Amino acid sequence: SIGTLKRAWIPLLILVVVAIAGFTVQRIRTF
Protein backbone atom coordinates (compact mmCIF):
# COMPACT_ATOMS: atom_id res chain seq x y z
CA SER A 1 0.00 0.00 0.00
CA ILE A 2 1.01 3.62 -0.58
CA GLY A 3 0.48 4.56 3.07
CA THR A 4 3.65 2.93 4.39
CA LEU A 5 5.79 3.97 1.39
CA LYS A 6 4.92 7.69 1.41
CA ARG A 7 4.80 8.28 5.18
CA ALA A 8 8.18 6.54 5.57
CA TRP A 9 10.14 8.07 2.70
CA ILE A 10 12.62 10.08 4.79
CA PRO A 11 13.70 7.09 6.95
CA LEU A 12 13.99 4.78 3.95
CA LEU A 13 15.91 7.36 1.92
CA ILE A 14 18.31 7.81 4.84
CA LEU A 15 18.68 4.03 5.17
CA VAL A 16 19.49 3.59 1.47
CA VAL A 17 21.96 6.50 1.50
CA VAL A 18 23.73 5.02 4.52
CA ALA A 19 23.65 1.59 2.88
CA ILE A 20 25.40 2.72 -0.29
CA ALA A 21 27.86 4.92 1.61
CA GLY A 22 28.76 2.04 3.93
CA PHE A 23 29.17 -0.36 1.03
CA THR A 24 31.48 1.96 -0.88
CA VAL A 25 33.52 2.86 2.21
CA GLN A 26 33.95 -0.82 3.09
CA ARG A 27 35.07 -1.41 -0.49
CA ILE A 28 37.57 1.46 -0.28
CA ARG A 29 39.07 0.37 3.04
CA THR A 30 40.66 -2.73 1.46
CA PHE A 31 42.77 -0.74 -1.03
Partner 1 sequence: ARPFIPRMIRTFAVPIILGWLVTIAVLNVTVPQLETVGQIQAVSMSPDAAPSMISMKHIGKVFEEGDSDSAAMIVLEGQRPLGDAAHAFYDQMIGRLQADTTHVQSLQDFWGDPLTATGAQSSDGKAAYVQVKLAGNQGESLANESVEAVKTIVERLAPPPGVKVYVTGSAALVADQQQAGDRSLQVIEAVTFTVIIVMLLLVYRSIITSAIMLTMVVLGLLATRGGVAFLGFHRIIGLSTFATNLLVVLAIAAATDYAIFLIGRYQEARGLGQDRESAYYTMFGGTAHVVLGSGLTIAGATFCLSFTRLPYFQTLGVPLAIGMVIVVAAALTLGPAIIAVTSRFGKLLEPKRMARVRGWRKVGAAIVRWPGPILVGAVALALVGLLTLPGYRTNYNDRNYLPADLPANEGYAAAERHFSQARMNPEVLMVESDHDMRNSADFLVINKIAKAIFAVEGISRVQAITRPDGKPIESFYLPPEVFDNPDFQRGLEQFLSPDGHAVRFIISHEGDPMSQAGIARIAKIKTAAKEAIKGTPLEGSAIYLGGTAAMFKDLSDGNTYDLMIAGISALCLIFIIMLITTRSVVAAAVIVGTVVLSLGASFGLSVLIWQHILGIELHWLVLAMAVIILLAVGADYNLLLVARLKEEIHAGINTGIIRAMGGSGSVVTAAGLVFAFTMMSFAVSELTVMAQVGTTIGMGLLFDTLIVRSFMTPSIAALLGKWFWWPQVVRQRPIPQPW
Ligand X SMILES: CCCCCCCC/C=C\CCCCCCCC(=O)O[C@@H](COC(=O)CCCCCCCCCCCCCCCCC)COP(=O)(O)OCCN
> Hey, CA dihedral for 19, 23, 28, 30, is it positive or negative?
positive
Binding of ligand X by 23 (CB under 6 A) = no
Identify the residue among 9, 15, 19, 24 touching ligand X (CB under 6 A): 9
Of ligand X, partner 1, none, which one does residue 29 interact with (CB within 5 to 8 Å by kind)? partner 1
Contacting positions for partner 1 (CB under 8 A): 10, 13-14, 17-18, 21, 24-25, 28-29, 31
Backbone phi, then psi, for 8, in 5-degree steps?
Answer: -115, 45
Residue positions counted in the chain: 31
**Which does residue 23 bind out of ligand X, partner 1, none, counting CB within 5 to 8 angstroms by kind?**
none
